[PDB]
Design an enzyme around this catalytic site. Structure first.
Site, mmCIF file in Angstrom:
data_model
loop_
_atom_site.group_PDB
_atom_site.id
_atom_site.type_symbol
_atom_site.label_atom_id
_atom_site.label_comp_id
_atom_site.label_asym_id
_atom_site.label_seq_id
_atom_site.Cartn_x
_atom_site.Cartn_y
_atom_site.Cartn_z
ATOM 1 N N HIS A 1 1.647 4.678 -2.737
ATOM 2 C CA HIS A 1 2.023 6.272 -2.318
ATOM 3 C C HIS A 1 3.079 6.641 -2.780
ATOM 4 O O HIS A 1 3.150 7.654 -3.752
ATOM 5 C CB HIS A 1 1.645 6.736 -1.032
ATOM 6 C CG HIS A 1 0.309 6.534 -0.426
ATOM 7 N ND1 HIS A 1 -0.917 6.965 -1.252
ATOM 8 C CD2 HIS A 1 -0.041 5.806 0.752
ATOM 9 C CE1 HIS A 1 -1.872 6.542 -0.536
ATOM 10 N NE2 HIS A 1 -1.440 5.813 0.667
ATOM 11 N N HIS B 1 0.904 -1.157 0.025
ATOM 12 C CA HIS B 1 -0.073 0.122 -0.017
ATOM 13 C C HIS B 1 0.755 1.099 -0.027
ATOM 14 O O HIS B 1 0.644 2.210 -1.032
ATOM 15 C CB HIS B 1 -0.924 0.313 1.513
ATOM 16 C CG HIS B 1 -1.836 1.109 1.077
ATOM 17 N ND1 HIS B 1 -2.875 1.214 0.828
ATOM 18 C CD2 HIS B 1 -1.449 2.412 1.828
ATOM 19 C CE1 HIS B 1 -3.789 2.331 0.823
ATOM 20 N NE2 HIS B 1 -2.690 2.954 1.590
ATOM 21 N N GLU B 2 1.865 1.390 0.983
ATOM 22 C CA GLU B 2 2.571 2.453 1.236
ATOM 23 C C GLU B 2 3.361 2.787 -0.202
ATOM 24 O O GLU B 2 3.691 3.833 -0.350
ATOM 25 C CB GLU B 2 3.642 2.320 2.349
ATOM 26 C CG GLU B 2 2.850 2.246 3.650
ATOM 27 C CD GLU B 2 1.862 3.408 4.002
ATOM 28 O OE1 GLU B 2 2.053 4.495 3.551
ATOM 29 O OE2 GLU B 2 0.756 3.215 4.774
ATOM 30 N N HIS C 1 -5.595 7.693 -2.637
ATOM 31 C CA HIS C 1 -6.786 6.519 -1.999
ATOM 32 C C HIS C 1 -7.733 6.504 -2.998
ATOM 33 O O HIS C 1 -8.227 7.402 -3.530
ATOM 34 C CB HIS C 1 -7.210 7.092 -0.780
ATOM 35 C CG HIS C 1 -6.067 6.900 0.401
ATOM 36 N ND1 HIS C 1 -6.017 7.671 1.391
ATOM 37 C CD2 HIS C 1 -5.395 5.644 0.565
ATOM 38 C CE1 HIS C 1 -5.073 6.990 1.995
ATOM 39 N NE2 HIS C 1 -4.631 6.065 1.623
HETATM 40 ZN ZN LIG Z 1 -2.631 5.129 2.167
#
Ligand SMILES: [Zn+2]
Ligand SMILES: [Ca+2]
Ligand SMILES: [Ca+2]
Ligand SMILES: [Ca+2]
Ligand SMILES: [Zn+2]
Length: 169
Positions: free
Chosen positions: A123, A119-120, A129
């Site tokens: 980014h 997930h990170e 998101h």
């Molecule tokens: Zn996030």
């Protein structure tokens, strides 16, 4: 999927990463494997490639930290914020910090390092998101079934490929 403002995007295909320190929660090899797998889900669907640096400044510096740790966004202790990462760019951009007041695990008995790392790094490569509930970039992804079943959703692939293109062909 959502992509960040003014589309911060890495202006190159080969990115380096560097694991700066190790959590006491896990064997070092388990931290190494979770970050490698997290990086490979994104590699599979873009022309991006990654390699590891042991010294010097890498694009994506990965570190475990607690509370105030050197940027303006201190972690909070147990639960709630688990990790945070900066959008593409130089210096602290692209870097990912993991809250070690969490209990990082290889499976689901604590906070699964693979899934939060994947997930990170989304980014770090420029995804924001998603509104799509089944997406890895959905805020609540930590309530999703890990590699008993995991696959990136079509939405995450659509999002990362709107930035960097499909795998080379
Ligand atoms: Zn996030
Ligand atoms: Ca960086
Ligand atoms: Ca926390
Ligand atoms: Ca910990
Ligand atoms: Zn931080």
């Amino acid at each position: 999927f959502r992509t960040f403002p003014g589309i911060p995007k890495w202006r190159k295909t080969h990115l380096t990463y560097r694991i700066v320190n190790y959590t006491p929660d896990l064997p070092k090899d388990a931290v190494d494997s979770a970050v490698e797998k997290a990086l490979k889900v994104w590699e599979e669907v873009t022309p991006l490639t990654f390699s590891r640096l042991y010294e010097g400044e890498a694009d994506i510096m990965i570190s475990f930290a607690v509370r105030e740790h050197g940027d303006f966004y201190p972690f909070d202790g147990p639960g709630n914020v688990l990790a945070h990462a900066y959008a593409p760019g130089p210096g602290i951009n692209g870097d990912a910090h993991f809250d070690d007041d969490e209990q990082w695990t290889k499976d689901t008995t604590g906070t699964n390092l693979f899934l939060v790392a994947a997930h990170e790094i989304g980014h770090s490569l420029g995804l924001f998101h998603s509104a799509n509930t089944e997406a890895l970039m959905y805020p609540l992804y930590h309530s999703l079934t890990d590699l008993t079943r995991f696959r990136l959703s079509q939405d995450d692939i659509n999002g990362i490929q709107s930035l960097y293109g499909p795998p080379p062909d």
